[PDB]
């Protein structure tokens, strides 16, 4: 991107946090900030030198220096858990506009919970269809951020992997799923397959073998 | 009261054409700057183009990846904003917004031509560009076992594989079983087809007695599937 933002930032409930936007154009231009929740229209939070739209809570405020612009939230609430985008010119003096990659803000309001992991081997039913899918289900963890890595035997598996973005459960804990697409030949040609879920620096691993 | 309503979104083949509409009300539309913004699935907001007012001669600017294929226009007499897209590509998905655009310029520290910001937004409209044809899902069982069981509870589910287009709705035991159920968001494979999973945690005790059937519904292909999930026989 031309405007760089943090991929994700976290903050304790009721505390202050600052997410930034950096770009050469910002040296000459001001940035605007937008909140975005899934299935809801974006909202302008801040723009110009010191401009906040009426209706936007005062805990939102923007600042700038050099090639960086910052959005600060003083006293984060539970609802503030959302995506945040900065916008400005792509170059100095440009008539075009552009957005940053956006930052996913996590507001921490619950105890950490270790992920519950279950790895399903390809069903006999599916294998008859000349297909094979390893299903790695992850549930009951907090906060909602995980890294999934697959292993064929001891070696890492690059392609065939598909992973969803974590979503809220009924109990406000998060859940995610990962899929490894194999051909029945590949599936039967290895001794075992493993699903490695990394959550908050710790890694949990589940394994299945074709001999079943 | 500012209102913005996008429409015209739908399915279209690569290389096809599509025109989006945006009806505006509650502000001076004649002199208002209007901007189209799109959010690809699982990605962020991307600036598409903007159309100015009478002062700058209704001039239009486009994002580089889109220029030459997209055209922005307006009809002030009925308060409509248009985005006309030709030779659509897959990347041109998926959710398009129109936004009332304000202009900002600080005379003492600012640099021309100032900045453009987006005061009001519509709900958006969804554009899907794929060569894929409508397909019903293949449903496979995620059978529970010792490996799927921990702490007196077990996990079982359904694999809803290779369907198009979205969405799929999944229930368990005709809606009776709702506790412990979680249906995952679909994933989009390189083939252009969707797949998702629906899991429910149940007491280990119940496995022997209770029956578990997932109900898969896919209205785009008019397909209903009742699939029973029971523990696999090792034999």
Author numbering:
A (entry chain B): 2 to 9, 11 to 95, 95A, 95B, 95C, 96 to 211
B (entry chain A): 1 to 52, 52A, 52B, 52C, 53 to 82, 82A, 82B, 82C, ...
The article reads:
One such antibody, the 10E8 antibody from donor N152, is perhaps the broadest of all HIV-1 antibodies thus far identified.
X-ray diffraction data from these three structures extended to 3.05, 1.70, and 1.60 Å respectively, and they were solved by molecular replacement and refined to Rwork/Rfree of 18.8/21.5, 23.7/27.1, and 19.4/20.9% for ligand-free mature H and L, gHv/gLv, and gHv/mature L versions of 10E8, respectively. Comparison of the structure of the mature uncomplexed Fab with that of the previously determined structure of mature 10E8 bound to its gp41 epitope showed minimal changes in the complementarity-determining regions (CDRs), with root-mean-square deviation (rmsd) for the entire Fv domain of 0.2 Å. Crystal structures of the (A) 10E8 gHv/gLv (B) 10E8 gHv/Mature L and (C) 10E8 mature are displayed in B factor putty representation colored from blue to red and with larger and smaller putty size based on atomic B factors scaled from 0 to 40 Å2.
